[PDB]
């Protein structure tokens, strides 16, 4: 509660300034996704140290991404569409070739060490029994073992699937920069001078058949009840390298379709583009 007071007095949000300095709200407002496109960011992820809110900022250090910022090399060479002036998907985890120990998993180890500490101090403030506390620690380390065990097949297999899907033709946008503190998607719109702009990214709230809601719960099955072709190795499933042709043809079909989707509208508007007008008086400065 104390560090919470010290943190929240600063504000629950902030805006990066034109000078680049952070400017915290000073207010304890509940966040809404409508703000995601606003200038504001959540304050927890500012990664700005505060004088007496240190444990908060520390626990917030646990949320830092463990990936890297790959250039979209092949998508560039294939001359695929890209909204960014330099395309760059952020792959969540590095390939860990040759290591005795998995760096992702060791990061999860330090994270659960700090978590064990936090849950511990809460456990002693709550005067709760030694048994339940040791059990919470037992689950924490069990999580750590499950994570080492699974991550060996995460960083080294899924990452090349992100690295490959990063190159697909229709993945034109940049997705992250790795900096939670400052990243915000570039917000293009189709401005019409004789109309109102349509933002591309909008909280239109249409769910696209439920696609825009996110269960975080899904991480539990990932850590626990799911298996990977690499994790199984003691049977050795051969890895699958899917034919490019399916997603390539699907992308081509989408592209080719919307490429000609707009043509009559575009042509007509091309014709009338000069047709907008302003009423104007013409005063006569001299005789005849």
């Amino acid at each position: 509660p104390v560090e919470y007071g010290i943190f929240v007095q600063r504000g629950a949000t902030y805006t990066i300034n034109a000078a680049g300095e952070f400017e915290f709200s000073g207010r304890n407002e509940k966040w809404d996704q409508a703000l995601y496109l606003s200038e504001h960011f959540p304050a927890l992820f500012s990664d700005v140290p505060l004088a007496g809110a240190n444990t908060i900022i520390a626990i917030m250090r646990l949320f830092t991404p463990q990936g890297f910022l790959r250039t979209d090399d092949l998508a560039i060479a294939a001359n695929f569409p890209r909204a960014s002036r330099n395309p760059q998907t952020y792959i969540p985890y590095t390939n860990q070739r040759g290591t005795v120990t998995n760096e992702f998993a060791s990061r999860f180890r330090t994270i659960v060490a700090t978590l064990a500490n936090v849950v511990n101090e809460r456990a002693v403030q709550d005067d709760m029994q030694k048994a339940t506390r040791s059990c919470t620690k037992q689950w924490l380390r069990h999580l750590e073992t499950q994570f080492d065990n699974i991550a060996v097949a995460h960083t080294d297999h899924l990452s090349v699937v992100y690295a490959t899907m990063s190159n697909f033709m229709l993945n034109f946008t940049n997705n992250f920069s790795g900096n939670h503190a400052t990243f915000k998607p570039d917000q293009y719109v189709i401005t019409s001078p004789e109309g109102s702009y349509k933002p591309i990214i909008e909280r239109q709230g249409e769910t696209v058949d439920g696609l825009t809601i996110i269960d975080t719960s899904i991480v539990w099955p990932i850590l626990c009840q799911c298996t990977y072709p690499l994790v199984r190795q003691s049977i050795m499933e051969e890895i699958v390298y899917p034919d490019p042709s399916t997603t390539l043809s699907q992308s081509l079909s989408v592209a080719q379709v919307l490429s000609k989707l707009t043509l009559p509208d575009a042509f007509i508007n091309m014709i009338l583009s000069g047709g907008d007008s302003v009423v104007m008086r013409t005063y006569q400065t001299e005789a005849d």
Partner: protein, 1057 residues
């Protein structure tokens, strides 16, 4: 000193170890040492730990395994206090053992070790292709040529680049890095040109003018703001470095242009690159605030974007339009050429323009950091003002400026117990003089004394005036810091008066340490406590002057006749605890225990006697003069009868009262009474109340009656005032050249752009003006400036309104003060006694001068820096004849003041007194022009010459100030003279050499012999109240004790024709 003199060198390459040292670069055997291996620090305000590894390790990526080490858990382990050095050394040492860089050591002396790649490959745990290349061929990390260090890894990997994460300099913060550096495979300059030109096609990248290891590297920022902070840090670096090169001193600079070049960036970065390239005078002047550096640079780029200077504006704009080009001064370019000469194949940024720097003549004043600027405004300057608009000062909070009514007095503890004497002059008391003095006394008493005198006497109480000193002594005694003092010393008395507890020395000059857990309360003192103490010290000083010990003799007693609580009786009883047999008792009609409660005169039955008596009797009841008279007479009568050394108070010391007392002591049978008027430093500064000192002496006393005595005149000159007392105003509107301000002070705040203007306008009234911004981010400047009447009497002599405004605009914005602390100005500031006497002189002479008709000019000979200007009316011409005076022909011409700037010639033949002139000789007659004192006969001679020289003139008036002889007789016997002295019998005011004094009788006799009209006048009490009111000054204690005897004995001769 135009050419830059610098040894450029690749410091980053120099930091890379020989391969053999890599085995022991951790120094595994020995512990890391502070300041050599690391630099830990703890900012307790920010509560932030900061560990900074030194040497090669300053550049170090950390594997997530490295972060799992306990050493990085420490800052979380110690939220509040600094990490103990033992834990820091132990943990940092164990982690230092934990690290081991891959390498293959080899004999070649030309080899280095690619430390960047080594630590990086380590931190990834060798999973990146660079990591595999290193883990399989560690020898690849060795390199002779610095560039091929990377070309080997590029050719070996087939990549066009690698992208290294940057280190955070503090190793404790784990926050995500703003940018990463990308090392490119570009061995030739042409490959670099291509990579740069391609780089301008892509967002958020920038690069250095030249690169380390001679291998091209580009920063890629994760966000715009991160780029902005980076660029700003680099602009600071290049600005400082260029600041050192401009001074011409040799510098070990890493590269000639330390700042970055955007390749692609937002508008705000392009602005940063432009002002950064400009090397604006504003950095050298410290005009920008560096607390929010990038913001300052943005605003600065704004001012340059529409600069008044066309050159600077067009240059900034050009720099903004082509930000990819690296603008640089020609002196930089010659350095770059020298570098290309020394290393022919070096890579450095190809796109560059060589602009000529534009000179600017405006030297802004600046000083960032705490401290208010204490301006001294000039009366006039180059700027010509015309009908300036009124400048409102804003309201200011008590968070910033408090206004205490009186300045507490800073003073040595001994000085409090000083006192001054005034012995009687008259040999007789004729009955007509009795009727006259009684008439003046009754008429004065019947209508109460001046309301302004009462306002001052009650505003400036001595108790609150001495309070900080006493509470300080108590505060040091409580901490045990106090130690040595003599048994009889005044410091011992102040200690007895500071604390309620008994003090006992363990031996000579050594007080007992406080018993543990015991913190005795400060001794309780009413307003008359310190005064009674000082009268006691005065009694001890009067029994013999030689004494340093103030303890009473054994088997002797004292009485404090006025009593309530009478704290002084307690402090005295406590002061003399080690002395055997010392009775000490209060004895008032209002007396509480210990003090006996009894009326005065004493009951016929009761037996009272003592070797000392300190009466302080003062009836609270309003009463008829006959009753006050008979009561005071009976009080002094019993006080004299009951003791050999009474020290009676007199509330209404009219000449009639004191002389009646002497007549009464004369009436008592068989005992002649020596007597003297007296006033302690511990008395209230403005009280006219006086302590008459009675003592028998075997001889009859020649000259026993008083007449025109100092202590008496301090009272009788005061009378009902024609005008209401002047309450000090606090002005907030600064009108241009108004002359409508009442005494008091301007105080408030203004926007800093308006600050130079307000100083140019308050100069008319205020003589000096303190100012300060409160913070770097707060635009307002607070301003306090008290109104000097002398500055008014100077500035309003003529209607011209010139000032040094052009100088004051140099100040904005950092050049006029900074202080976070609240400041506490006083409505009544402290002043030395000599200054106040001078102001009383000026009030007397000014009121005397306004009365005179048809006078063409005032000639103040010996006028120094126009000090007598307060006296002279704004109409008549002023003339100074002091050689010491500085010449200012512009100020003289603009303010109607001729200045002779030559010594005055006192010889009568050389004399040149004009008709209708007022000649001021205020304290100038007593000194030679070089400052050595003239002998008194020479003084009386030159007075005689100024007297005879005026004998011819039809209309003239001289005011010759001089010191009367009697004062030396009084200061030989007094104690309260911290400033005035008597070295070998001569007066020694302030810092002047001692000077012999004239006798008033011989001077008046001489003026009678001259036949000239004359009058020996001195400033009165109302003149003192006038000085203190108009100037915003409070008198203080020692000043209030010595002012009567000093001012009464500095007569002003008033010659007239």
């Amino acid at each position: 000193m135009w050419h830059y003199t610098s040894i450029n060198n690749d410091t980053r390459v120099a930091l890379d170890p020989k391969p053999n040292q890599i085995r022991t670069i951790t120094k595994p055997n020995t512990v890391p040492q502070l300041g050599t291996d690391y630099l830990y620090t703890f900012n307790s305000q920010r509560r932030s730990h900061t560990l900074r590894l030194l040497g090669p390790f300053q550049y170090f990526n950390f594997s997530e395994t490295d972060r799992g080490h306990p050493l990085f858990r420490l800052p979380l382990k110690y939220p509040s206090k600094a990490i103990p050095a033992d834990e820091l050394i132990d943990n940092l040492h164990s982690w230092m053992r934990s690290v081991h860089l891959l390498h293959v050591r080899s004999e070649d002396n030309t080899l280095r070790y690619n430390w960047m790649l080594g630590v990086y490959a380590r931190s990834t745990n060798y999973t990146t292709p660079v990591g595999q290349l290193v883990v399989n061929a560690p020898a690849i990390l060795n390199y002779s040529n610095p560039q091929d260090a990377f070309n080997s890894v590029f050719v070996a990997l087939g990549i066009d680049y690698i992208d290294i994460p940057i280190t955070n300099s503090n190793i404790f913060d784990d926050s995500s890095t703003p940018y990463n550096v990308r090392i490119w495979h570009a061995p030739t300059m042409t490959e670099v040109n291509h990579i740069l030109a391609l780089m301008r096609k892509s967002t958020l990248v920038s690069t250095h003018s030249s690169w380390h290891w001679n291998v091209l590297h580009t920063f890629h920022y994760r966000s715009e703001s991160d780029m902005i902070d980076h660029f700003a840090a680099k602009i600071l670096e290049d600005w400082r470095q260029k600041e050192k090169l401009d001074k011409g001193a040799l510098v070990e600079a890493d590269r000639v242009i330390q700042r970055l070049i955007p390749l692609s960036s937002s508008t705000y970065v392009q602005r940063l690159a432009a002002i950064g390239a400009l090397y604006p005078n504003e950095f050298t002047e410290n005009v920008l605030d560096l607390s929010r550096l990038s913001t300052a640079l943005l605003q600065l780029s704004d001012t340059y974007y529409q600069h008044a200077n066309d050159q600077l504006r067009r240059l900034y704009r050009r720099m903004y339009n082509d930000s990819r080009t690296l603008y640089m001064t020609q002196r930089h370019q010659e350095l770059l050429l020298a570098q290309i000469t020394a290393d022919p194949n070096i890579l450095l940024y190809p796109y560059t323009y060589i602009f000529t720097t534009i000179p600017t003549s405006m030297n802004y004043i600046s000083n960032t950091g705490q401290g208010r600027i204490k301006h001294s405004l000039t009366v006039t300057g180059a700027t010509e003002h015309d009908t300036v608009a009124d400048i409102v000062l804003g309201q200011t909070g008590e968070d910033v400026i408090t206004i205490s009514m009186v300045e507490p007095m800073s003073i040595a503890v001994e000085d409090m117990y000083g006192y001054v004497l005034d012995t009687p002059t008259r040999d007789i008391w004729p009955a007509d003089e009795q009727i006259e003095q009684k008439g003046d006394a009754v008429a004065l008493y019947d209508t109460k004394t001046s309301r302004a005198l009462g306002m001052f006497n009650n505003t400036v109480r001595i108790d609150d005036l001495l309070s900080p000193l006493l509470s300080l002594v108590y505060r040091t005694y409580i901490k045990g810091d106090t130690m040595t003092m003599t048994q009889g010393s005044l410091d011992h008395l102040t200690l007895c008066a500071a604390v309620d507890s008994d003090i006992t020395f363990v031996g000579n000059r050594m007080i007992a340490p406080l018993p543990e857990g015991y913190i005795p309360k400060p001794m309780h003192r009413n307003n008359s406590t310190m005064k009674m103490l000082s009268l006691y010290v005065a009694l001890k000083k009067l029994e013999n002057f030689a004494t340093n010990s103030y303890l009473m003799a054994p088997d002797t007693s004292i009485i404090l006749l006025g009593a309530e609580r009478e704290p002084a009786v307690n402090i005295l009883r406590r002061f003399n605890r080690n002395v055997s047999n010392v009775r000490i008792i209060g004895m008032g009609d209002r007396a509480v225990e210990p003090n006996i409660r009894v009326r005065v005169p004493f009951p016929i039955d009761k037996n009272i006697s003592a070797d000392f008596i300190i009466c302080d009797i003062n009836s609270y009841e309003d009463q008829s003069f006959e009753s006050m008279f008979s009561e005071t007479i009976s009080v002094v009568t019993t006080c004299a009868s009951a003791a050999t050394r009474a020290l009676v108070k007199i509330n209404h010391p009219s000449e009639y009262m004191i002389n009646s007392v002497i007549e009464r002591l004369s009436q008592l049978g068989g005992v002649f009474y020596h007597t003297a008027l007296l006033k302690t430093a511990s008395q209230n500064p403005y009280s006219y109340e006086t302590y008459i000192y009675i003592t028998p002496i075997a001889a009859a006393v020649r000259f026993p009656f008083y007449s025109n005595s100092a202590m008496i005149n301090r009272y009788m000159t005061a009378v009902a005032d024609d005008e209401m007392p002047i309450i000090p105003s606090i002005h907030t509107v600064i009108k241009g050249h108004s002359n409508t301000y009442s005494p008091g002070l301007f105080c408030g705040c203004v926007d800093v752009q308006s600050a130079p203007l307000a100083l140019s306008q308050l100069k008319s009234y205020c003589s000096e003006a303190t100012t300060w911004r409160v913070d770097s981010d707060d635009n307002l400047v607070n301003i306090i400036a008290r109104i000097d009447p002398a500055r008014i009497a100077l500035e309003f002599r003529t209607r011209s309104n010139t000032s040094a405004y052009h100088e004051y605009q140099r100040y904005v914005p950092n050049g006029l003060g900074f202080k976070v602390r609240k400041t506490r100005e006083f409505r009544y500031m402290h002043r030395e006694v000599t200054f106040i006497h001078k102001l009383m002189m000026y009030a007397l002479i000014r009121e005397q001068i306004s009365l005179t008709e048809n006078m063409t000019q005032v000639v103040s000979i010996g006028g120094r820096n126009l000090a007598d200007i307060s006296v002279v009316p704004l109409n008549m011409k002023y003339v100074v004849i002091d050689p010491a005076t500085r010449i200012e022909t512009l100020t003289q011409e603009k303010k109607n003041i001729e200045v002779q700037s030559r010594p005055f010639q006192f010889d009568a033949a050389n004399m040149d007194l004009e008709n209708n002139s007022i000649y001021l000789f205020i304290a100038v007659i007593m000194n030679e022009p070089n400052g050595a004192a003239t002998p008194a006969r020479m003084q009386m001679d030159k007075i005689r010459n100024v007297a005879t020289a005026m004998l011819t003139r039809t209309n003239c008036v001289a005011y010759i100030s001089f010191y009367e002889a009697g004062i030396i007789t009084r200061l030989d016997q007094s104690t309260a003279h911290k400033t005035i002295r008597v070295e070998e019998g001569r007066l020694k005011v302030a810092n002047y050499v001692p000077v012999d004094t004239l006798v008033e009788a011989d001077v008046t006799l001489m003026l009678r012999d001259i036949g000239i009209t004359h009058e020996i006048i001195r400033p009165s009490t109302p003149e003192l109240i006038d000085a203190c009111s108009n100037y915003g000054i409070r008198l203080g204690s020692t000043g209030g004790a010595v002012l009567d005897v000093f001012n009464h004995y500095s007569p002003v001769i008033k010659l007239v024709r």
